[PDB]
RNA sequence: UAGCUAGUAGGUGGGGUAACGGCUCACCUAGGCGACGAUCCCUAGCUGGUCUGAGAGGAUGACCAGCCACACUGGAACUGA
RNA sequence: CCCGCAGAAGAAGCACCGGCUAACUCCGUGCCAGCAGCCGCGGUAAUACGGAGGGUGCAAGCGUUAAUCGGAAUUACUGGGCGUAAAGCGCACGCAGGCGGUUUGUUAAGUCAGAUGUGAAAUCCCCGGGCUCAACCUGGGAACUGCAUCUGAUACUGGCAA
């Protein structure tokens, strides 16, 4: 705090960690998506979260979250991973872009359809 | 031992008024008189005395316009651990002009307003406010 | 772009006449314009501190028919244009040609003036223009193309301007249907109620 | 679709083994009044 | 070889040339010794469309500069006072 | 004529034998638009009954603090117990841009200006008492002329 | 008048050379303090007269060696 | 990452480059850098500027422009101002 | 760029509505399906889920991730703390380093002022113009917080001397 102490050891600006290790921190990534399973949340919540373990193109095997209502994913069929941890799941720090590669949009969805990638009811 | 006796002068001025005293006495030197002469002109104080042959004791008489002291805050600026030397274009305007900022210019120890009239720059001693 | 929906609904949220359908009627006198903002019309809102600061800025845009993207650039321009920013923001919105044609009286509404200016009918300094956002410089003239003279709308809108405040920062002749912008409007020269300091503080954060 | 439970191998019983999984944990409902029914703001805090 | 040529600023189809003292190796808009004046071809009745320090150009042509053809013909248009 | 403004209203409890009793606390400020500001805290057991107990404590304890033309005089540091409040003159900067609870105590004072940043812990009861301390610690050009220098023409120019 | 610098000799024996070090006062650009700072040079001198720990005068010359371009002008004192 | 360096620090004479110089040799003297951080490891083109910020700073340097570096990888020389 | 058409004719969507943060209620599902940025909502009267009515925020663009800065005075030089919240080394001696009472003389490195050279142009900023005007283009200045040299001031700081 003394000025003579700051010319010696400068005011060391700490650095924060990146919330998502998406490697070079690029908007989305593409992974093959092995092991599509379900999980139960933390203590206050109680549900059956649709979770997938994505083998990213970098080489990582981070897990992701299929946010939506209906999913038709398999042990393959590449998907597009988007940042954002949920809250109540351990280790889940990514989302799935519904409406991309082989991840179809949510059937029966007409209120936030750009989220979840539903086209439009034509008129 | 004391490092900057000039910062001791302001400490006598601050604590003297805080204790509600009529006058204070401190060991004298050239600069303590020179800043007192600035404070005497500016009205922040009543007359001083440097009476004493071998041990000059500087004796400032404090000033109270009302029940509250006149010298509200008197902050040392160019302390020895961090000496500041501002130029003509960046002399501070303490309390937007409602307080002085005593500078030591090459032409002498002056207030900031008179040194700005003089067009000089120097060591920023204190912020008498 | 431009808001193209129901016009009184904008004036219904502000609880005041935004002159969007300003003509030979009072309000409409029959559709509840005092207090029935939407469906929940009896629901009297409290309007927290942000909701007041938003609503004042929303009032001005609905008056002058501008959009947020172009409005923020007026704020940036007003903030560098010396002096009181809030008056300068009012100096710019009054400087729009789209407002000038309205104040001259050729517009029944600014929406009529927006169509009239855009459909190649108005000439500033003998130069035809189409931009609604033309900043009318001081000591200039505004006029109409003669093929746009006698359109039976520039007549009808001009009569209603007699029932207006007759602004003094600009004068108008009605012979050859042209007017002259004279000086910048002062803050006290108009509007008397449209707050400006709430707009500055909104963008101040 | 397939529930991932927290036990690697399963021997001698499926339904009974899932009974000691956190899927079938006890769910205690936080009561609205009485013991353990205090809330800071609740669901809509307008005063 | 030092020469006095033109740059090409401005937008597409609306150019603003700049009479510039540059070595004749660098590109159209590259490094230059000293920008001396300008030019505006699509200028009609405004300010000048062409203003350039003829006292400076004589200082360069004496040292060994080369006046480019479009430059010399524009100097010819603004000879000394005509 | 006064322009009272409610700032914050919360709910404190006591915890007696069979439960806790939610007494409500209010925090209002009456003003003048001229320089007289006073905050009345108050608290009761009902919400509209607590502001009335806050309206009275405000009016009886208003402090008359002078000011130039709708703005503060010099920069001032209103520190009080949780907040290191700073207010800056902001000459004709046409905005009462300030934090929560600092906007209310200034726009009833008749300030159509001053920039203000609330350092330290933001706390409504304290940040109101911070600026009230901050305005009282501000001196008039005539007031500083009275105690030193002795000419408002001299000290200012 | 030609450019020249003072400085005190730190290292002595170099076989027809010497090493000086100039104390210079730099205001730290962030914190602000007139910090004493030292730059070492390699100073040539014919007649190796000046020893160690003495204030000399150097001027910048044509480079006489690998990172050695300074030379001696005068000497204010040799030793007390 | 705490000791690092032996053509390395410097001198005398020869040679060499457009040009000074360990740039390169012979001999001689043992020094040189080092907590104001040497060597080593990792990462990275630099600057005008750019994006933010009240300011101070922080982060980053695509386009436009100056400089440097590279031209399948490693190395060398010729021609030529 | 200017003129003509029995022609409004070819051109409006996108998130959000518990609070933070503008914006309200009903049906269907009942801690199941799902929402999320944070606090946290859903357990058969949900304005927080899904779908409709309206409402708001923006608009040929919105919304979500991603990166930096701001908010963050949560790296504090401007501008923070250390009895108990994280923090005074167990204590002391002590080199380098940092700072240092008072008087006078001197020098003028630090400091301050003025001039010169340079600080490329462009960009940013301020007055002026030009494409129907704005983005953009652009003339003239300011600025480029700097560095160096020279000439002075020389109180304060430093060196030297008594
Ligand atoms: Mg647009
Ligand atoms: Mg009571
Ligand atoms: Mg060399
Ligand atoms: Mg040799
Ligand atoms: Mg590229
Ligand atoms: Mg380039
Ligand atoms: Mg080159
Ligand atoms: Mg090769
Ligand atoms: Mg029709
Ligand atoms: Mg939602
Ligand atoms: Mg709903
Ligand atoms: Mg952050
Ligand atoms: Mg702290
Ligand atoms: Mg403890
Ligand atoms: Mg202890
Ligand atoms: Mg010592
Ligand atoms: Mg100078
Ligand atoms: Mg100069
Ligand atoms: Mg123009
Ligand atoms: Mg220009
Ligand atoms: Mg300057
Ligand atoms: Mg003297
Ligand atoms: Mg010192």
From Swiss-Prot, chain D:
Disulfide bonds: none annotated. Keywords: RNA-binding, rRNA-binding, Translation regulation, tRNA-binding. Changing residue 19 to C: About 50% ribosome rescue activity, initial rate. Residues 29-47 are annotated as: Disordered. GO terms for biological process: regulation of translation; rescue of stalled ribosome. Residues 32-46 have a biased composition (Basic residues). Changing residue 10 to N: 90% decrease in kcat for peptidyl-transferase by RF2. Disruption phenotype: Cells lacking this gene are viable, but those lacking both arfA and ssrA are non-viable. One of its GO terms (molecular function) is tRNA binding. Changing residue 17 to C: No change in ribosome rescue activity. Changing residue 29 to A: No change in kcat for peptidyl-transferase by RF2. Changing residue 40 to C: About 20% ribosome rescue activity, initial rate. Interacts with the 50S ribosomal subunit. Interacts with RF2/PrfB on the ribosome. Contacts ribosomal protein S12 (rpsL). Rescues ribosomes stalled at the 3' end of non-stop mRNAs. This activity is crucial when the stalled ribosome cannot be rescued by the SsrA(tmRNA)-SmpB quality control system. Binds the 30S subunit, contacting 16S rRNA with the N-terminus near the decoding center and its C-terminus in the mRNA entry channel; contacts change in the presence of release factor 2 (RF2, also named PrfB). Requires RF2/PrfB to hydrolyze stalled peptidyl-tRNA on the ribosome; recruits and probably helps position RF2/PrfB correctly in the ribosomal A site so RF2's GGQ motif can hydrolyze the peptidyl-tRNA bond. Belongs to the alternative ribosome-rescue factor A family. Active protein is only produced when SsrA(tmRNA)-SmpB-mediated trans translation is limited. ArfA can be synthesized from truncated mRNA, via ribonuclease 3 and the SsrA tagging system. In the presence of SsrA, the stalled ribosome is rescued and the incomplete nascent ArfA is tagged for degradation. In the absence of SsrA, truncated ArfA chains are released from the ribosome and are functional. This is Alternative ribosome-rescue factor A. It comes from Escherichia coli (strain K12). The gene is arfA. The chain holds residues 2 to 48 of 72 of the full protein.
Curated annotation (Swiss-Prot), chain E:
InterPro entries: Ribosomal_bS16, Ribosomal_bS16_CS, Ribosomal_bS16_dom_sf. Belongs to the bacterial ribosomal protein bS16 family. The keyword Lipid biosynthesis does not apply. GO terms for molecular function: structural constituent of ribosome. It comes from the Bacteria. The keyword Chaperone does not apply. GO terms for biological process: translation. Keywords: Ribonucleoprotein, Ribosomal protein. PANTHER family: 30S RIBOSOMAL PROTEIN S16 (PTHR12919), SMALL RIBOSOMAL SUBUNIT PROTEIN BS16M (PTHR12919:SF20). Pfam families: Ribosomal_S16. Gene3D superfamilies: 3.30.1320.10. It comes from Escherichia coli O45:K1 (strain S88 / ExPEC). SUPFAM superfamilies: Ribosomal protein S16. This is Small ribosomal subunit protein bS16. The gene is rpsP. One of its GO terms (cellular component) is small ribosomal subunit.
